Design a protein around this nucleic acid. Sequence first.
DNA 1: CCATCAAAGAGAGAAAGAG
DNA 2: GCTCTTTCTCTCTTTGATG
Lengths: 194, 194
Amino acid sequence: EGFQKRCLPVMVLKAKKPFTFETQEGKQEMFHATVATEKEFFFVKVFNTLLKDKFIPKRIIIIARYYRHSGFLEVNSASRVLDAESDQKVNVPLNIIRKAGETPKINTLQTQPLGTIVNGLFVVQKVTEKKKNILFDLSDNTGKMEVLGVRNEDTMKCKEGDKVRLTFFTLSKNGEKLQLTSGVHSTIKVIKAK
Amino acid sequence: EGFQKRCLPVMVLKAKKPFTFETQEGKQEMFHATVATEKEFFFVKVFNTLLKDKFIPKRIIIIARYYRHSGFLEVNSASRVLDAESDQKVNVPLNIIRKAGETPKINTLQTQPLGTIVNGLFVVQKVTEKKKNILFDLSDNTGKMEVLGVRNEDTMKCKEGDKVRLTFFTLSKNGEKLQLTSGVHSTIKVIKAK
DNA sequence: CCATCAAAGAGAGAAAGAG
DNA sequence: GCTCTTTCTCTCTTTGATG
Protein backbone atom coordinates (compact mmCIF):
# COMPACT_ATOMS: atom_id res chain seq x y z
CA GLU A 1 0.00 0.00 0.00
CA GLY A 2 2.01 2.94 -1.36
CA PHE A 3 -0.17 5.53 0.36
CA GLN A 4 1.73 8.77 0.77
CA LYS A 5 0.39 10.84 3.66
CA ARG A 6 3.01 13.50 3.04
CA CYS A 7 1.92 16.44 0.93
CA LEU A 8 3.38 17.52 -2.38
CA PRO A 9 3.14 20.53 -4.69
CA VAL A 10 2.67 19.66 -8.34
CA MET A 11 2.30 21.72 -11.49
CA VAL A 12 -0.72 20.27 -13.28
CA LEU A 13 0.35 19.69 -16.87
CA LYS A 14 -2.95 18.38 -18.19
CA ALA A 15 -6.35 17.34 -16.89
CA LYS A 16 -8.86 15.72 -19.22
CA LYS A 17 -12.65 15.77 -19.09
CA PRO A 18 -14.41 13.45 -16.63
CA PHE A 19 -15.94 10.27 -18.01
CA THR A 20 -18.03 7.37 -16.78
CA PHE A 21 -16.89 3.79 -16.40
CA GLU A 22 -19.19 1.01 -15.24
CA THR A 23 -17.44 -1.35 -12.83
CA GLN A 24 -19.10 -2.83 -9.73
CA GLU A 25 -20.62 -0.16 -7.54
CA GLY A 26 -22.29 1.14 -10.69
CA LYS A 27 -21.51 4.19 -12.79
CA GLN A 28 -18.19 5.57 -11.66
CA GLU A 29 -16.81 9.09 -12.02
CA MET A 30 -13.19 10.03 -12.79
CA PHE A 31 -10.83 11.74 -15.20
CA HIS A 32 -7.21 11.55 -16.30
CA ALA A 33 -4.57 14.17 -15.63
CA THR A 34 -0.81 14.63 -15.83
CA VAL A 35 1.26 16.54 -13.24
CA ALA A 36 4.91 17.42 -12.61
CA THR A 37 7.57 18.27 -10.04
CA GLU A 38 10.97 19.87 -10.65
CA LYS A 39 12.34 16.36 -11.00
CA GLU A 40 9.77 13.95 -12.42
CA PHE A 41 6.23 13.63 -13.79
CA PHE A 42 3.39 11.14 -13.20
CA PHE A 43 0.04 10.22 -14.69
CA VAL A 44 -2.85 10.62 -12.30
CA LYS A 45 -6.13 8.84 -11.72
CA VAL A 46 -8.55 11.31 -10.14
CA PHE A 47 -11.80 9.69 -8.99
CA ASN A 48 -13.62 12.87 -8.00
CA THR A 49 -15.25 14.54 -11.02
CA LEU A 50 -15.59 17.68 -8.91
CA LEU A 51 -11.82 17.94 -8.39
CA LYS A 52 -11.60 19.59 -11.80
CA ASP A 53 -11.66 22.77 -9.72
CA LYS A 54 -8.11 21.86 -8.71
CA PHE A 55 -6.51 20.16 -11.70
CA ILE A 56 -5.96 22.79 -14.34
CA PRO A 57 -3.04 23.06 -16.73
CA LYS A 58 -0.13 25.15 -15.41
CA ARG A 59 -1.87 25.29 -12.04
CA ILE A 60 0.04 24.37 -8.90
CA ILE A 61 -1.68 22.28 -6.25
CA ILE A 62 -0.45 20.79 -3.00
CA ILE A 63 -1.60 17.21 -2.84
CA ALA A 64 -1.78 15.25 0.41
CA ARG A 65 -2.43 11.58 1.19
CA TYR A 66 -2.20 9.94 -2.25
CA TYR A 67 -1.80 6.27 -3.24
CA ARG A 68 1.07 6.20 -5.85
CA HIS A 69 0.73 2.99 -7.91
CA SER A 70 3.01 1.20 -10.35
CA GLY A 71 3.20 3.55 -13.34
CA PHE A 72 0.97 6.32 -12.10
CA LEU A 73 -0.57 7.84 -9.00
CA GLU A 74 -4.06 7.88 -7.48
CA VAL A 75 -5.96 10.78 -5.95
CA ASN A 76 -9.03 9.46 -4.09
CA SER A 77 -11.58 10.25 -1.35
CA ALA A 78 -9.45 9.19 1.65
CA SER A 79 -6.96 11.68 0.23
CA ARG A 80 -6.98 15.45 0.47
CA VAL A 81 -5.98 18.10 -2.07
CA LEU A 82 -5.54 21.85 -1.68
CA ASP A 83 -4.31 25.02 -3.33
CA ALA A 84 -0.82 26.45 -2.82
CA GLU A 85 0.22 29.98 -1.84
CA SER A 86 2.27 32.22 -4.14
CA ASP A 87 4.91 30.99 -1.69
CA GLN A 88 5.36 27.61 -3.46
CA LYS A 89 8.01 27.07 -6.15
CA VAL A 90 8.38 23.62 -7.81
CA ASN A 91 9.95 24.52 -11.23
CA VAL A 92 9.44 21.99 -14.03
CA PRO A 93 12.14 22.31 -16.70
CA LEU A 94 10.94 22.20 -20.30
CA ASN A 95 12.25 18.75 -21.12
CA ILE A 96 10.13 17.24 -18.32
CA ILE A 97 7.11 19.22 -19.48
CA ARG A 98 7.87 18.37 -23.10
CA LYS A 99 8.41 14.68 -22.36
CA ALA A 100 5.21 14.69 -20.27
CA GLY A 101 3.02 15.40 -23.28
CA GLU A 102 4.71 13.52 -26.13
CA THR A 103 3.19 10.41 -27.68
CA PRO A 104 5.68 7.60 -27.15
CA LYS A 105 7.50 6.21 -30.18
CA ILE A 106 6.59 2.60 -30.90
CA ASN A 107 10.25 1.53 -31.00
CA THR A 108 10.69 3.19 -27.61
CA LEU A 109 7.91 0.93 -26.34
CA GLN A 110 9.60 -2.34 -27.28
CA THR A 111 12.27 -1.30 -24.77
CA GLN A 112 9.87 -0.26 -22.02
CA PRO A 113 8.82 -2.47 -19.11
CA LEU A 114 5.34 -3.95 -19.29
CA GLY A 115 2.88 -2.20 -16.99
CA THR A 116 4.23 1.04 -18.38
CA ILE A 117 1.20 3.24 -18.84
CA VAL A 118 0.89 4.40 -22.45
CA ASN A 119 -1.06 7.47 -23.59
CA GLY A 120 -0.87 8.93 -27.09
CA LEU A 121 -2.29 9.97 -30.44
CA PHE A 122 -1.68 7.25 -32.99
CA VAL A 123 -2.31 6.49 -36.67
CA VAL A 124 -4.54 3.50 -37.45
CA GLN A 125 -3.31 1.18 -40.21
CA LYS A 126 -5.68 -1.78 -39.98
CA VAL A 127 -8.65 -2.64 -37.79
CA THR A 128 -10.37 -6.01 -37.21
CA GLU A 129 -13.62 -6.35 -35.26
CA LYS A 130 -14.01 -9.02 -32.57
CA LYS A 131 -16.97 -10.16 -30.51
CA LYS A 132 -16.49 -7.83 -27.55
CA ASN A 133 -13.23 -6.33 -28.81
CA ILE A 134 -11.51 -4.51 -31.65
CA LEU A 135 -7.99 -5.01 -32.94
CA PHE A 136 -6.43 -1.74 -33.99
CA ASP A 137 -3.11 -2.07 -35.75
CA LEU A 138 -1.41 1.29 -35.28
CA SER A 139 1.88 2.23 -36.89
CA ASP A 140 4.08 5.29 -37.23
CA ASN A 141 7.52 5.78 -38.75
CA THR A 142 9.44 3.83 -36.08
CA GLY A 143 7.35 0.72 -36.65
CA LYS A 144 4.09 -1.00 -35.80
CA MET A 145 2.32 -2.46 -32.80
CA GLU A 146 -1.15 -3.66 -31.89
CA VAL A 147 -3.70 -2.78 -29.23
CA LEU A 148 -6.90 -4.50 -28.14
CA GLY A 149 -9.61 -2.05 -27.17
CA VAL A 150 -13.31 -2.01 -26.41
CA ARG A 151 -15.98 -2.53 -29.04
CA ASN A 152 -18.55 0.28 -28.94
CA GLU A 153 -20.27 3.28 -30.55
CA ASP A 154 -17.44 5.60 -31.57
CA THR A 155 -14.63 3.04 -31.69
CA MET A 156 -16.86 1.45 -34.29
CA LYS A 157 -16.44 4.34 -36.75
CA CYS A 158 -12.64 3.96 -36.79
CA LYS A 159 -11.02 3.21 -40.17
CA GLU A 160 -7.63 3.30 -41.93
CA GLY A 161 -6.49 6.89 -41.92
CA ASP A 162 -8.23 7.81 -38.71
CA LYS A 163 -6.29 8.40 -35.54
CA VAL A 164 -7.04 7.27 -32.03
CA ARG A 165 -6.19 9.01 -28.82
CA LEU A 166 -5.33 6.29 -26.28
CA THR A 167 -5.33 7.02 -22.55
CA PHE A 168 -4.20 4.74 -19.74
CA PHE A 169 -3.48 1.67 -21.81
CA THR A 170 -0.85 -0.74 -20.49
CA LEU A 171 2.13 -2.27 -22.25
CA SER A 172 1.31 -5.97 -22.44
CA LYS A 173 4.04 -6.71 -24.98
CA ASN A 174 7.38 -5.35 -26.13
CA GLY A 175 10.05 -6.18 -28.67
CA GLU A 176 9.01 -6.70 -32.29
CA LYS A 177 5.38 -5.65 -32.83
CA LEU A 178 4.73 -4.66 -29.21
CA GLN A 179 1.21 -4.70 -27.85
CA LEU A 180 -0.98 -2.66 -25.54
CA THR A 181 -4.34 -3.68 -24.19
CA SER A 182 -7.38 -1.89 -22.78
CA GLY A 183 -7.75 -1.59 -19.04
CA VAL A 184 -10.63 -0.75 -16.75
CA HIS A 185 -9.69 2.91 -16.72
CA SER A 186 -8.38 3.18 -20.26
CA THR A 187 -10.17 5.60 -22.56
CA ILE A 188 -9.89 5.87 -26.32
CA LYS A 189 -11.10 8.57 -28.72
CA VAL A 190 -11.47 8.14 -32.48
CA ILE A 191 -10.27 11.13 -34.46
CA LYS A 192 -11.58 10.92 -38.00
CA ALA A 193 -9.21 12.00 -40.78
CA LYS A 194 -9.16 15.31 -42.70
CA GLU B 1 -23.71 49.54 -55.36
CA GLY B 2 -27.18 50.51 -54.13
CA PHE B 3 -30.49 48.62 -54.11
CA GLN B 4 -30.10 45.13 -55.52
CA LYS B 5 -33.10 43.36 -56.96
CA ARG B 6 -31.57 40.10 -58.15
CA CYS B 7 -31.10 36.68 -56.63
CA LEU B 8 -27.97 36.26 -54.56
CA PRO B 9 -27.10 32.94 -52.89
CA VAL B 10 -25.26 33.41 -49.58
CA MET B 11 -24.18 31.15 -46.77
CA VAL B 12 -25.54 32.30 -43.45
CA LEU B 13 -22.62 32.53 -41.03
CA LYS B 14 -23.80 34.36 -37.94
CA ALA B 15 -27.27 35.48 -36.99
CA LYS B 16 -28.01 37.12 -33.65
CA LYS B 17 -30.97 37.33 -31.30
CA PRO B 18 -33.45 40.03 -32.34
CA PHE B 19 -33.55 43.23 -30.32
CA THR B 20 -35.70 46.34 -30.28
CA PHE B 21 -34.79 49.99 -30.88
CA GLU B 22 -36.29 53.48 -31.30
CA THR B 23 -36.60 56.19 -33.98
CA GLN B 24 -38.66 59.33 -34.60
CA GLU B 25 -41.29 56.89 -35.88
CA GLY B 26 -41.10 54.98 -32.60
CA LYS B 27 -40.15 51.39 -31.79
CA GLN B 28 -38.70 48.92 -34.30
CA GLU B 29 -37.37 45.37 -34.47
CA MET B 30 -34.41 43.69 -36.12
CA PHE B 31 -31.52 41.30 -35.74
CA HIS B 32 -27.86 41.19 -36.74
CA ALA B 33 -26.30 38.52 -38.94
CA THR B 34 -23.23 37.62 -41.01
CA VAL B 35 -23.46 35.94 -44.43
CA ALA B 36 -20.94 35.25 -47.18
CA THR B 37 -20.49 34.49 -50.85
CA GLU B 38 -17.58 32.45 -52.17
CA LYS B 39 -15.52 35.59 -52.72
CA GLU B 40 -16.65 37.75 -49.74
CA PHE B 41 -18.53 38.10 -46.41
CA PHE B 42 -21.17 40.57 -45.22
CA PHE B 43 -22.72 41.90 -42.04
CA VAL B 44 -26.50 42.22 -42.15
CA LYS B 45 -29.20 44.43 -40.72
CA VAL B 46 -32.39 42.42 -41.02
CA PHE B 47 -35.38 44.47 -39.90
CA ASN B 48 -37.96 41.87 -40.72
CA THR B 49 -37.46 39.52 -37.84
CA LEU B 50 -39.48 36.68 -39.33
CA LEU B 51 -36.38 36.03 -41.43
CA LYS B 52 -35.00 34.04 -38.51
CA ASP B 53 -36.43 31.07 -40.42
CA LYS B 54 -33.86 31.55 -43.16
CA PHE B 55 -31.02 33.21 -41.24
CA ILE B 56 -29.16 30.46 -39.43
CA PRO B 57 -25.50 29.47 -39.80
CA LYS B 58 -24.40 27.04 -42.53
CA ARG B 59 -27.73 27.46 -44.31
CA ILE B 60 -27.60 28.67 -47.91
CA ILE B 61 -30.28 31.18 -48.85
CA ILE B 62 -31.06 33.45 -51.78
CA ILE B 63 -32.02 37.10 -51.60
CA ALA B 64 -33.24 40.05 -53.68
CA ARG B 65 -34.60 43.58 -53.12
CA TYR B 66 -32.07 44.28 -50.35
CA TYR B 67 -29.84 47.33 -49.95
CA ARG B 68 -26.06 47.59 -50.14
CA HIS B 69 -24.50 50.27 -47.90
CA SER B 70 -20.89 51.23 -47.16
CA GLY B 71 -19.82 48.45 -44.81
CA PHE B 72 -23.03 46.44 -44.51
CA LEU B 73 -26.28 45.14 -46.01
CA GLU B 74 -29.92 45.98 -45.38
CA VAL B 75 -32.76 43.49 -45.53
CA ASN B 76 -36.19 45.06 -45.19
CA SER B 77 -39.73 43.66 -45.29
CA ALA B 78 -39.83 44.69 -48.96
CA SER B 79 -37.15 42.17 -50.01
CA ARG B 80 -37.36 38.38 -50.31
CA VAL B 81 -35.31 35.54 -48.84
CA LEU B 82 -35.66 31.84 -49.72
CA ASP B 83 -34.30 28.37 -49.03
CA ALA B 84 -31.96 27.80 -51.95
CA GLU B 85 -32.29 24.98 -54.45
CA SER B 86 -30.52 21.75 -53.57
CA ASP B 87 -28.40 22.69 -56.60
CA GLN B 88 -27.00 25.88 -55.03
CA LYS B 89 -23.28 25.91 -54.22
CA VAL B 90 -22.01 28.96 -52.32
CA ASN B 91 -18.78 27.24 -51.33
CA VAL B 92 -17.05 29.40 -48.74
CA PRO B 93 -13.26 29.15 -48.09
CA LEU B 94 -12.17 28.92 -44.46
CA ASN B 95 -10.19 32.15 -44.49
CA ILE B 96 -13.37 34.10 -45.15
CA ILE B 97 -15.21 32.22 -42.45
CA ARG B 98 -12.36 32.80 -40.00
CA LYS B 99 -12.21 36.45 -41.00
CA ALA B 100 -15.97 36.93 -40.94
CA GLY B 101 -16.14 35.95 -37.29
CA GLU B 102 -12.94 37.22 -35.69
CA THR B 103 -12.70 40.30 -33.49
CA PRO B 104 -10.57 42.84 -35.38
CA LYS B 105 -7.28 43.94 -33.82
CA ILE B 106 -7.32 47.59 -32.77
CA ASN B 107 -4.23 48.58 -34.74
CA THR B 108 -5.83 47.02 -37.82
CA LEU B 109 -8.73 49.45 -37.33
CA GLN B 110 -6.40 52.44 -37.19
CA THR B 111 -5.61 51.80 -40.85
CA GLN B 112 -9.18 50.97 -41.98
CA PRO B 113 -11.54 53.40 -43.78
CA LEU B 114 -13.99 55.21 -41.53
CA GLY B 115 -17.60 54.15 -41.97
CA THR B 116 -16.48 50.61 -41.37
CA ILE B 117 -18.68 48.44 -39.20
CA VAL B 118 -16.98 46.82 -36.22
CA ASN B 119 -18.20 43.88 -34.13
CA GLY B 120 -16.16 42.11 -31.46
CA LEU B 121 -15.31 41.07 -27.90
CA PHE B 122 -12.93 43.58 -26.30
CA VAL B 123 -11.27 44.06 -22.89
CA VAL B 124 -12.51 47.06 -20.91
CA GLN B 125 -9.71 49.32 -19.67
CA LYS B 126 -11.39 52.36 -18.08
CA VAL B 127 -14.89 53.84 -18.04
CA THR B 128 -15.79 57.53 -17.77
CA GLU B 129 -19.56 57.82 -17.52
CA LYS B 130 -21.10 60.86 -19.24
CA LYS B 131 -24.56 62.44 -19.23
CA LYS B 132 -25.96 61.08 -22.49
CA ASN B 133 -23.32 58.41 -23.09
CA ILE B 134 -20.52 56.35 -21.65
CA LEU B 135 -16.95 56.66 -22.91
CA PHE B 136 -15.32 53.23 -23.05
CA ASP B 137 -11.54 53.18 -23.40
CA LEU B 138 -10.75 49.68 -24.65
CA SER B 139 -7.51 47.80 -25.25
CA ASP B 140 -5.80 44.76 -26.65
CA ASN B 141 -2.17 43.85 -27.38
CA THR B 142 -2.24 46.12 -30.42
CA GLY B 143 -3.30 49.31 -28.65
CA LYS B 144 -6.07 51.57 -27.38
CA MET B 145 -9.30 53.04 -28.71
CA GLU B 146 -12.21 54.98 -27.20
CA VAL B 147 -15.86 54.15 -27.77
CA LEU B 148 -18.94 56.23 -26.98
CA GLY B 149 -21.96 54.03 -26.41
CA VAL B 150 -25.31 54.35 -24.67
CA ARG B 151 -25.54 54.89 -20.91
CA ASN B 152 -27.89 52.35 -19.29
CA GLU B 153 -28.56 49.31 -17.07
CA ASP B 154 -26.44 46.59 -18.64
CA THR B 155 -23.89 49.02 -20.10
CA MET B 156 -23.42 50.11 -16.50
CA LYS B 157 -22.84 46.53 -15.29
CA CYS B 158 -19.41 47.00 -16.82
CA LYS B 159 -16.20 47.49 -14.86
CA GLU B 160 -12.47 47.33 -15.53
CA GLY B 161 -11.45 43.80 -16.42
CA ASP B 162 -14.84 42.89 -17.82
CA LYS B 163 -15.36 42.51 -21.54
CA VAL B 164 -17.96 43.98 -23.84
CA ARG B 165 -19.33 42.64 -27.10
CA LEU B 166 -20.03 45.41 -29.62
CA THR B 167 -22.18 44.79 -32.65
CA PHE B 168 -22.50 47.29 -35.48
CA PHE B 169 -20.46 50.14 -34.10
CA THR B 170 -19.03 52.46 -36.77
CA LEU B 171 -15.43 53.65 -37.07
CA SER B 172 -15.55 57.40 -36.51
CA LYS B 173 -11.90 58.33 -35.97
CA ASN B 174 -8.91 56.30 -37.09
CA GLY B 175 -5.12 56.53 -36.96
CA GLU B 176 -3.36 56.75 -33.62
CA LYS B 177 -6.13 56.61 -31.02
CA LEU B 178 -9.14 55.63 -33.14
CA GLN B 179 -12.67 55.86 -31.75
CA LEU B 180 -15.82 53.81 -32.35
CA THR B 181 -19.27 55.37 -32.11
CA SER B 182 -22.74 54.13 -31.23
CA GLY B 183 -25.64 54.39 -33.66
CA VAL B 184 -29.28 53.36 -33.87
CA HIS B 185 -28.60 49.78 -34.78
CA SER B 186 -25.59 49.14 -32.56
CA THR B 187 -25.75 46.78 -29.58
CA ILE B 188 -23.58 46.05 -26.54
CA LYS B 189 -23.43 43.25 -23.96
CA VAL B 190 -21.43 43.38 -20.75
CA ILE B 191 -19.56 40.29 -19.58
CA LYS B 192 -18.49 40.23 -15.92
CA ALA B 193 -14.78 39.56 -15.45
CA LYS B 194 -14.39 35.94 -14.34
C1' DC C 1 5.76 28.92 -39.89
C1' DC C 2 1.79 25.90 -40.26
C1' DA C 3 -1.51 21.82 -39.52
C1' DT C 4 -4.01 19.03 -36.04
C1' DC C 5 -6.35 18.51 -31.34
C1' DA C 6 -8.29 19.95 -27.32
C1' DA C 7 -10.86 22.75 -23.97
C1' DA C 8 -12.91 26.96 -21.75
C1' DG C 9 -16.18 30.90 -22.58
C1' DA C 10 -19.95 33.07 -24.97
C1' DG C 11 -24.40 32.85 -27.54
C1' DA C 12 -28.83 30.83 -29.39
C1' DG C 13 -32.48 27.58 -29.92
C1' DA C 14 -35.41 24.53 -28.10
C1' DA C 15 -37.01 21.72 -24.15
C1' DA C 16 -38.58 20.67 -19.39
C1' DG C 17 -40.43 22.23 -14.78
C1' DA C 18 -42.61 25.85 -11.61
C1' DG C 19 -46.05 29.88 -10.67
C1' DG D 1 -54.55 25.83 -19.23
C1' DC D 2 -50.44 29.18 -20.25
C1' DT D 3 -45.54 32.53 -19.59
C1' DC D 4 -41.27 32.60 -17.31
C1' DT D 5 -36.80 30.59 -15.85
C1' DT D 6 -33.32 26.86 -15.74
C1' DT D 7 -30.64 23.01 -18.69
C1' DC D 8 -28.48 21.07 -22.51
C1' DT D 9 -27.42 20.80 -26.72
C1' DC D 10 -24.33 22.65 -30.22
C1' DT D 11 -21.10 25.87 -32.47
C1' DC D 12 -17.92 29.12 -32.91
C1' DT D 13 -14.15 31.99 -31.09
C1' DT D 14 -9.54 31.84 -28.58
C1' DT D 15 -5.96 30.08 -26.99
C1' DG D 16 -2.55 26.80 -25.87
C1' DA D 17 -0.12 22.25 -26.75
C1' DT D 18 1.66 19.07 -30.09
C1' DG D 19 4.31 17.39 -34.26
